[PDB]
Design a protein around this ligand. Structure first.
Ligand SMILES: Nc1nc2c(ncn2[C@@H]2O[C@H](COP(=O)(O)OP(=O)(O)OP(=O)(O)O)[C@@H](O)[C@H]2O)c(=O)[nH]1
Ligand SMILES: [Mg+2]
Lengths: 163, 585, 570, 415, 13, 142, 10
């Protein structure tokens, strides 16, 4: 049992990751204004995964799910270098709060198909993840249409559940 | 985790609300600690108990996350109670209701018509205009289908998305075309409500929708000539709900058209005769018929029968039908102004009714009944009624006498006579907004201010607690004291205008705490006015200004300082700026 | 249904008529119309049972007015039952005869009342003494005709002071009902007899015999001190009502004492700890107690000018006590207790009762008005309460800081540099116009005074008369302070005021300001910019002629309302 | 001076009604509850309501509104104190005072209301003497009803003769949020249970500062009686003369003296706490409780209440000594320490949650109130010296005393 | 009355 | 357009509220307490019509439990009484001899009959059979 | 009680 939140920018494929982890394929996806939730059993751990829609106007309402949070999914788009500053601002807005203070971090670098997409390291250093503290963070570059590294991230997350 | 009905019995076993709130907060903390465990099994009854708390009015703002989670569930009863909690705990200004968009959208694409029924239900009851712009592409898609359980909900959900976004109605114009032969009368009822709404919104839609007048003429003729139906039927009419809606769509269409108004001529002539004034329902049918007649540009021969109908509706001893007949003649004021005027004794007779609503509607109906001939005899009984009113009727009557006197006054002397009689008999019940209206009309008068202000001073010597009366009177004294005190610069043979109690009545208003301090603003304004209008007794009001310089109000202190500087330093500028104020409209 | 009850009543068994009359008074208990069963329970009245006849007297009291014609069938039974060996049934019949208010009955009710005045047992004597006042309430001139006033004076001349105390209560009632024709003031010897009657009668009788002292005024210094030396131990009584009337007569009689003698200061210092102790009473008495304290601290502010810690409110206190403790802290705010009062009121804006917070902010304002020493600390505290940015808190604090600025406009020119940002979306017109006065009045240290009024001039024509007139004054004052920037602003507000507005005083002040601006705008530097005098504030001290009348009424409804008694009685 | 004494239910219909003068009509009680709701919802909730020229003096019971109506200028504290005495006498009679006592024991209560008041005048309002001739189980009235001494009837006889004294302390305290004392006063109240024979007379001996100054022994330990308000039975003229508590006692349980004084001694239980109010997450109460009094007394059954947020959830209490029950019905906690010795400090750490969504209105910040009770201890140091039984027969009664330290309104303000 | 009593001297002359 | 639906007892206890106009909860309590005060303080020959705050209000006494709505003041008024009577027959047909305790204990079913009879303020099924049949079919899904 | 009454009386 682990409350999991999927936050991040819009057009980043967080719902693509969500329906790749639940059903196994890539369904026709509308821009998700509200939220989504399924339960992914993986490594005999039911991952209750709260996918949160990443539009602009819902971004103030993201604090409503930060309660009882045990692990984080932070999906970024790797094809938008111009959106890394607002993603870093949202990241440092989300992490420095009293609610959501002891939950592990797992940042997804989705859409690793184009040369615009960087590695984990450049997206890390543009976020500046080494400045963090008391956060069990790990970035992971994924390919949601093929499902690359999503279940590896769930494996590490199941390692981050128990201690 | 007790049941819902267990909490119902728990609260019903409470006598005192000081103990009933304790019993609320016990189970409320039970629900709160239950929601910390993220339980999805008892969440139905936990949210149901929380809604039972909200229904009596207890803090239930916290349990809207779990309402969204019940909508984000997968079982039918959980979604049912979740959409109930969404319609009860969430509204437009809740600020957290924007998360329902994805869930209602997937539940508009749910396989079951009942789950799509709930997704249409919650969106039609409380769907915000931002949610209307996000869901109306799928609202019309459930109008692009043909499921008669879903079409009735999609049509009124389209009414809702027009109600919240009236600039989105253009995409339902191609979706509403020629579904107007649906046999399901519920779908047909929602479609006629949708057409009534669309014809209410835009005149560009009228021309597309006044073409389908004879289609719904045939529909209404089929429903009138329908002798009986097993369902839809109360008091022997096959769906009178849809009959009134079709008559209302007939009422708003053809109201400035002649071709469609005569296309609906014969069905109105039928339903004026194929109704029944026995129970409530046929009187409703016939009243909506007479409204449709009096609002379209009909034949006046229909209006002969319709005024015969309304004369019958005045005769009915049911207070329902008396309210209906008063509302009837209140609707056809300008339409057929002649034949309503011969109901005048009955309209005045309805003023002595034992209901607040019937006295109110008969009062407003006598107000709208005023023409350029009935101004003499009716106003006597109207002011007698105002003298025999209740304090809740006095504001509306005091406004309506003024409004019907400003239009149809036969004599400006008698106009101000009726106005002054109202200002005596109402006093502190007339609205202060009518006071500059009275001021503007008496300064629109130019030949009678002697007869005005002498009678003003004769009335206000007895009273000043009538606050709008002295709101009038202070400006009246300050502007027309020269016509009040006439030719009396020194002591003469004793005339009742005395120019020492003329100032002392305003000063006594000033000293008395029965003063709203715009009484005092008007009064000090009158004092500064009457230093040039009066050369009789001056340098005594300057004493009043100089001793008034330390008063406790802010503006009155400013006013006393700005007067006293003129009265002591710039006496040459006082008479330069004390001309009468010019007349506006 | 009632015929069955009348058939139970018309029987001859005691247990049947007893359950019958119990069902009658049980129907009367919930208020059923058992008035129709009057003349038959009249017959079932003369019984040897004493428990039964109390129920019958209860019925006759509750239905004396109901059957004015059928009530003549009881007078023989009353004059019989006033001739009984049991004094309980005699005094019971006497107090029944007094409460029956029928003028057809009370003609024959004079002589058995006169006999029960002259009875031996003090129980029926003190009952008949109150019954004299009962009959004088029914018919005063019949009591004057029978001469019961002298017998009432003879029960003043009685022993066993309960009869005397009921006689004093009846005399206070009857002389109140008098036009004071033949006023019943006593010689001081009978007054000293009442002083001997004081340590013996009941604690209720000890109230009414102190109520006769509200009608007598002593003539000497030694007479007043001599009676007040034994009025003084009544302040140490458990009941607050004896203490309150003793406080009333001591406030009445302290205007006869020599202040230069040490007995007056002895009265002063021995009165204040009972007045502090009465605050520990149960809170419905504390409401009247706080109103009477307000009546005293206006009369004598020297009494409680050192006891501030006890007038702090508590969380369990209701609204009618918490609002009055604020007023007493207003009436007792002094120079040295400024810190505790201001920090106390600082913790009073932190409440959820809106009107309590509004009254607290007004109390801080009246503190800044009343003393000039801690006006600055009031300003700092109120600005820190503006820093809460609670809407009604700001809507009160703007008006309060305005009224601070009206009395003391002197050294508050850096305060307004914060007040320019004060949640400019404020809604209430009493504080919108207050902020307009704060801007336009102080429009020389405020540089952006023009552009903030652009918000206030947009929706101009539908706000108020007050807000529009404060705008009309403040823009003229601003333009006189700066003629360069707001040249268009004064012209457009004169165009909005004179031409299109029909608000009559707004029109008049607009045409006056326009004729002043057109005639001589430089002369406005002396006309509208004249040196304002020190504003005589609204001092809420009650008139000492009226206050001395309210010294004579302490513990009354007039004492609560702070009104003359005739202002509300009918 | 009330014309009609009324008791209503919580809805507004007549439980019991009793008119005296006819100045108030009986139909005017029906306006009371609409006027009650009308004045209550605007913050004008006062014990005196008005309907034109008719007033409504009222005190409030748990289920009962003792409505006292008058039309002219009634003596007000007369009326309210008689209402309190009616409450006290009926509580002596009916130990629970509810509608079952009104609607079923209606045989005696009308007689009680007839006896206690005539014409709006209270005449004889003592409970024990009224027992002797108004029973529910009648002879002449006693002479003690007519006596100057109207609290002790002759003829009372017991086998043993015992006088029980209860010196009960009550520490009133209002400590601000800064940590300083705003008001440390003590309202002390001595309640006596006297079982004697006949008409005794009792002279109480106390260690008064003023009386020892009258004596010349004002350098030892004594109590500074700032004010004392006695019962009716104490001859107050003699107490004004030479501080003498001379009284014929009433029979049974009665409160002798209600004294009040100010005390600059430190508070008994000091409550320090910090509150880390985070947004939409949780709250923490790191509350400590030290005792400033001596290391020999133990505070029985304390109940240290801390007011909590109304919609808190998942309560946690890392305590050291003492149990916690979270009371969300009153929105508080009860940190109960049964045996709380002196000179010790017991820590409690609380941790709650908080909902992610805020409320429409605010909640308020109530102060901290604890419920200590200490036997064999007086913070004032007041000690009874003697109690001389005076009897024409002449015997040895048993003046027994115990010392109890309780609280009054022991408030400490919160952040 | 679980709290027991204490006896005072009667006279304290 | 029906702006609200209110169901309050004779004692004033709120048994069913409904808001077709999204006004906040303090305004809900204000307006609700005002309407409860108005209707309970009016006689029995007063047409069951109140003109209250631009609303020709339609209420009706069927029992001690009072029913209340308000149509827009441009429509026919007696049909709102027919709507309330039709909904009475709906509660009687789905519940079966509809008691007060049937409304007390099983209030959510009355809310759901209201949901399947009116959304947005307007009648969505005019049949007295199709609506109760559909809610018994949704109960048949459970 | 007064609550067990059915409303419409069918
Ligand atoms: N090539 C490639 N495209 C991807 C991948 N993941 C997501 N996308 C694309 O990204 C687009 C946006 O993703 P969506 O899942 O539809 O929407 P979203 O990013 O979750 O945004 P919201 O719906 O608002 O939550 C999709 O249309 C996909 O085509 C990926 O791993 N590889
Ligand atoms: Mg998505």
């Amino acid at each position: 049992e682990m409350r999991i939140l999927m936050v991040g920018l819009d057009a980043a494929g967080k719902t693509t990751i969500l329906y790749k982890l639940k059903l196994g394929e890539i369904v026709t996806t509308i821009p998700t204004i509200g939220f989504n939730v399924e339960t992914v059993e993986y490594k005999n751990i039911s991952f209750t995964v709260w996918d949160v829609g990443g539009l602009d106007k819902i971004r103030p309402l993201w604090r409503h799910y930060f309660q009882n949070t045990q692990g984080l999914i932070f999906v970024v788009d790797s094809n938008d270098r111009e959106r890394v500053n607002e993603a870093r601002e949202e990241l440092m807005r989300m992490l420095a709060e009293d609610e959501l203070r002891d939950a592990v971090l797992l940042v997804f670098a989705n859409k690793q198909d184009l040369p615009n997409a960087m590695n984990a390291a450049e997206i890390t250093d543009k976020l500046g993840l080494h400045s963090l503290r008391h956060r069990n963070w790990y970035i992971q570059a994924t390919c949601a249409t093929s499902g690359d590294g999503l279940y590896e991230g769930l494996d590490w997350l199941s390692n981050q559940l128990r201690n | 985790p007790i049941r819902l009905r267990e909490l119902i019995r728990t609260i019903r076993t409470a006598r005192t609300q000081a103990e009933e709130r304790e019993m609320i907060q016990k189970e409320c903390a039970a629900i709160r600690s239950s929601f910390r465990e993220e339980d999805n099994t008892y969440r139905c009854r936990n949210v149901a108990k929380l809604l039972y708390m909200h229904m009596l009015g207890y803090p239930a703002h916290f349990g809207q996350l779990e309402c969204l989670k019940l909508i984000a569930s997968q079982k039918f009863t959980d979604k049912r109670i979740g959409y109930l909690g969404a319609m009860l705990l969430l509204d437009e200004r809740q600020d957290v209701h924007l998360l329902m968009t994805n869930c209602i959208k997937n539940d508009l694409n749910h396989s079951t018509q009942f789950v799509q029924g709930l997704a249409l239900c919650t969106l039609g009851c409380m769907g915000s205009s931002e949610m209307c712009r996000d869901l109306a592409g799928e609202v019309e898609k459930l109008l692009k289908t043909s499921n008669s359980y879903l079409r009735k909900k999609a049509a009124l959900c389209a009414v809702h998305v027009i109600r919240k976004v009236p600039e989105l109605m253009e995409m339902f114009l191609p979706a509403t075309k020629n579904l107007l032969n649906e046999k399901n009368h519920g779908v047909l009822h929602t479609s006629v409500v949708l057409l009534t709404e669309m014809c209410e919104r835009s005149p560009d839609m009228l021309a597309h929708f006044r073409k389908l007048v004879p289609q719904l003429v045939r529909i209404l003729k089929n429903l009138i000539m329908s002798g009986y139906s097993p369902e839809h039927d109360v008091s022997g009419i096959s769906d009178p709900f849809l009959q009134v809606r079709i008559l209302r769509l007939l009422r708003i269409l053809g109201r400035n058209d002649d071709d469609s108004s005569e296309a609906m001529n014969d069905i109105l002539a039928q339903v004026a005769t194929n109704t029944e004034t026995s129970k409530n329902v046929g009187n409703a049918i016939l009243y909506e018929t007479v409204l449709t007649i009096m609002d379209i540009k009909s034949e006046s021969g229909l209006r002969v029968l319709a005024i015969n109908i309304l004369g019958r509706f005045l005769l009915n001893n049911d207070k329902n039908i008396r309210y209906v007949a008063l509302t009837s003649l209140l609707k056809t004021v300008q339409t057929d102004h002649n034949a309503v005027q011969r109901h005048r004794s009955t309209i005045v007779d309805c003023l002595k009714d034992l209901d607040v609503s019937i006295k109110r509607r008969a009062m407003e109906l006598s107000f709208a009944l005023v023409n350029g001939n009935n101004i003499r005899g009716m106003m006597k009984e109207l002011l007698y009624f105002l003298d025999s009113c209740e304090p809740e009727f006095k504001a509306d009557c005091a406004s309506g006498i003024f409004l019907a006197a400003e239009k149809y006054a036969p004599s400006k002397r008698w106009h101000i006579d009726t106005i002054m009689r109202v200002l005596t008999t109402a006093g502190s019940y007339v609205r202060d907004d009518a006071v500059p209206n009275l001021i503007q009309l008496i300064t629109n008068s130019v030949e009678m201010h002697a007869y005005t202000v002498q009678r003003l001073y004769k009335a206000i010597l007895g009273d000043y607690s009538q606050q709008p009366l002295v709101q009038v009177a202070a400006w009246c004294i300050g502007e027309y004291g020269d016509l009040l005190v006439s030719g009396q610069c020194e002591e003469e043979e004793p005339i009742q205008v005395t120019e020492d109690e003329v100032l002392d009545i305003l000063e006594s208003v000033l000293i008395s705490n029965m003063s709203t301090s715009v009484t005092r603003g008007y009064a000090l304004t009158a004092i500064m006015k009457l230093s040039t209008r009066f050369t009789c007794t001056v340098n005594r009001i300057k004493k009043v200004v100089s001793i008034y310089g330390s008063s406790i109000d802010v503006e009155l202190q400013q006013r006393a300082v700005e007067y006293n500087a003129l009265f002591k330093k710039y006496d040459h500028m006082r008479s330069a700026l004390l001309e009468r104020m010019p007349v506006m409209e | 249904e009632i015929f069955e009850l009348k058939a139970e009543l018309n029987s001859d068994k005691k247990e049947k008529k007893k359950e019958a009359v119990k069902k009658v008074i049980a129907s009367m208990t919930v208020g059923k119309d058992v008035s129709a069963l009057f003349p038959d329970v009249v017959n079932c009245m003369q019984t040897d049972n004493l428990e039964l006849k109390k129920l019958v007297y209860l019925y006759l009291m509750n239905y004396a007015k109901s059957q004015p014609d059928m009530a003549i069938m009881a007078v023989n039974t009353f004059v019989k039952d006033c001739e009984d060996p049991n004094p309980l049934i005699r005094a019971l019949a006497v107090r029944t005869m007094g409460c029956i208010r029928v003028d057809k009955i009370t003609e024959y009710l004079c002589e058995p009342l006169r006999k029960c005045l002259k009875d031996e047992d003090p129980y029926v004597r003190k009952t008949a003494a109150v019954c004299v006042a009962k009959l004088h309430d029914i018919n005063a001139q019949l009591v004057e005709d029978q001469g019961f006033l002298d017998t009432l004076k003879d029960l003043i001349s009685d022993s066993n002071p309960m009869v005397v105390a009921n006689a004093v209560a009846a005399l206070s009632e009857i002389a109140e009902s008098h036009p004071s024709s033949n006023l019943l003031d006593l010689n001081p010897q009978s007054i000293n007899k009442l002083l001997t009657a004081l340590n013996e009668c009941t604690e209720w009788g000890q109230i009414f015999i102190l109520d006769c002292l509200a009608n007598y005024m002593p003539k000497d210094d030694r007479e007043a001190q001599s009676i007040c030396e034994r009025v003084t131990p009544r302040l140490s009584h458990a009941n607050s009502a004896v203490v309150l009337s003793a406080v009333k007569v001591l406030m009445k009689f302290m205007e006869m004492l020599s202040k230069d003698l040490d007995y007056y200061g002895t009265l002063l210092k021995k009165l204040a700890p009972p007045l502090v102790t009465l605050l520990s009473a149960e809170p419905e008495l504390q409401y009247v107690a706080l109103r009477n304290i307000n009546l005293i601290v206006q009369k004598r502010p020297e009494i409680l000018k050192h006891e501030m810690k006890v007038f702090f409110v508590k969380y369990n206190d209701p609204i009618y006590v918490k609002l009055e403790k604020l007023d007493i802290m207003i009436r007792l705010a002094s120079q040295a207790n400024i810190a505790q009062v201001l920090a106390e009121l600082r913790e009073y804006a932190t409440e959820v009762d809106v009107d309590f917070v509004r009254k607290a902010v007004r109390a801080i304002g009246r503190c800044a008005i009343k003393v000039e020493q801690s006006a600055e600390r009031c300003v700092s505290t109120l600005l820190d309460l503006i820093q809460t940015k609670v809407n009604y808190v700001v809507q009160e604090a703007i008006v309060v800081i305005k009224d601070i600025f009206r009395k003391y406009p002197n050294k508050y020119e850096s305060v307004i540099a914060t007040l320019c940002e004060n949640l400019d979306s404020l809604d209430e017109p009493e504080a919108r116009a207050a902020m307009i006065w704060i801007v336009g009045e102080y429009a020389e240290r405020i540089d952006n005074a023009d552009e903030l009024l652009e918000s206030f001039l947009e929706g101009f024509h539908d706000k108020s008369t007050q807000v529009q007139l404060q705008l009309l004054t403040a823009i003229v004052k601003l333009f006189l302070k700066k003629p360069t920037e707001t040249q268009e602003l004064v012209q457009q507000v004169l165009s909005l005021a004179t031409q299109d507005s029909d608000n009559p005083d707004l029109r008049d002040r607009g045409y006056i300001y326009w004729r002043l601006l057109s005639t001589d705008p430089v002369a406005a530097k002396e006309v509208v910019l004249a040196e304002k005098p020190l504003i005589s504030e609204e001092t809420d001290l009650i008139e000492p002629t009226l206050l001395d009348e309210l010294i004579c009424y302490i513990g009354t409804l007039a004492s609560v309302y702070h009104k003359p008694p005739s202002a509300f009685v009918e | 001076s009330a014309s009609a004494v009324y008791v209503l239910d919580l809805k507004g219909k007549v439980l019991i009604c009793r008119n005296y003068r006819g100045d108030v009509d009986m139909s005017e009680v029906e306006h009371f509850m609409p006027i009650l709701m009308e004045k209550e919802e605007e913050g004008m909730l006062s014990p005196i309501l008005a309907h034109g020229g008719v007033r409504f003096m009222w005190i409030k019971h748990n289920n009962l509104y003792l409505v006292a109506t008058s039309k002219k200028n009634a003596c007000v504290s007369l009326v309210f104190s008689f209402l309190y005495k009616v409450v006290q006498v009926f509580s002596e009679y009916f130990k629970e005072l509810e509608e079952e006592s009104i609607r079923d024991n209606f045989v005696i209560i009308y007689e009680l209301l007839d006896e206690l008041m005539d014409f709006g005048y209270p005449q004889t309002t003592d409970s024990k003497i009224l027992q002797e001739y108004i029973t529910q189980e009648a002879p002449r009235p006693p002479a003690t009803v007519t006596n100057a001494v109207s609290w002790r009837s002759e003829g009372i006889k017991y086998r043993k003769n015992e006088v029980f004294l209860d010196v009960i302390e009550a520490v009133n305290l209002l400590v601000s949020a800064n940590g300083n004392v705003l008001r440390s006063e003590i309202v002390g109240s001595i309640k006596m249970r006297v079982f004697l024979s006949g008409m005794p007379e009792l002279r109480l001996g106390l260690n008064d500062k003023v009386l020892f100054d009258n004596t010349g022994r004002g350098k030892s330990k004594s109590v500074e009686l700032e004010d004392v308000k006695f019962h009716q039975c104490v001859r107050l003229s003699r107490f004004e003369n030479d501080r003498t508590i001379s009284f014929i006692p009433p029979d049974g349980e009665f409160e002798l003296m209600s004294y009040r004084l100010n005390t600059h001694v430190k508070p008994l239980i000091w409550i320090e706490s910090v509150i880390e109010k985070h947004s939409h997450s949780r709250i923490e109460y790191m509350v400590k409780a030290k005792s400033q009094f001596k290391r020999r007394s133990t505070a029985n059954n304390v109940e240290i209440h801390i007011p909590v947020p109304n919609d808190a959830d998942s309560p946690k209490f890392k305590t050291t000594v003492g149990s916690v029950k979270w009371v969300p019905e009153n929105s508080e906690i009860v940190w109960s320490v049964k045996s709380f010795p002196g000179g010790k400090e017991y820590l409690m750490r609380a941790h709650f949650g908080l909902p992610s969504v805020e409320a429409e209105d605010k909640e308020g910040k109530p102060p901290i109130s604890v419920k200590f009770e200490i036997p064999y201890f007086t913070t004032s140091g007041i000690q009874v010296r003697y109690l001389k039984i005076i009897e024409k027969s002449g015997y040895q009664a048993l003046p027994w005393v115990r010392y109890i330290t309780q609280n009054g309104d022991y408030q400490l303000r919160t952040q | 009355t679980s709290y027991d009593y204490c006896r005072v001297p009667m006279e304290d002359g | 357009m029906i702006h609200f639906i209110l169901l309050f007892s004779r004692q004033g206890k709120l048994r069913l509220q409904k808001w077709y106009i999204t006004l906040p909860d303090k305004e809900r309590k204000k307006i609700t307490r005002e309407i409860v005060q108005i209707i309970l303080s009016r006689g029995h020959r007063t047409s069951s019509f109140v003109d209250w705050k631009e609303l020709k209000l339609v209420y009706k006494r069927y029992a001690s439990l009072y029913f209340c709505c308000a149509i827009e003041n441009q429509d026919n008024e007696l049909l709102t009484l027919e709507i309330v009577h039709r909904y009475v027959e709906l509660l009687d047909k789905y519940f079966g001899n509809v008691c007060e305790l049937d409304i007390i204990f099983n209030f959510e079913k009355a809310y759901f009959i209201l949901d399947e009879f009116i959304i947005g303020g307007e009648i969505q099924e005019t049949s007295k059979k199709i609506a109760v049949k559909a809610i018994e079919d949704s109960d048949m899904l459970q | 009680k007064g609550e067990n009454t059915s409303a419409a009386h069918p």
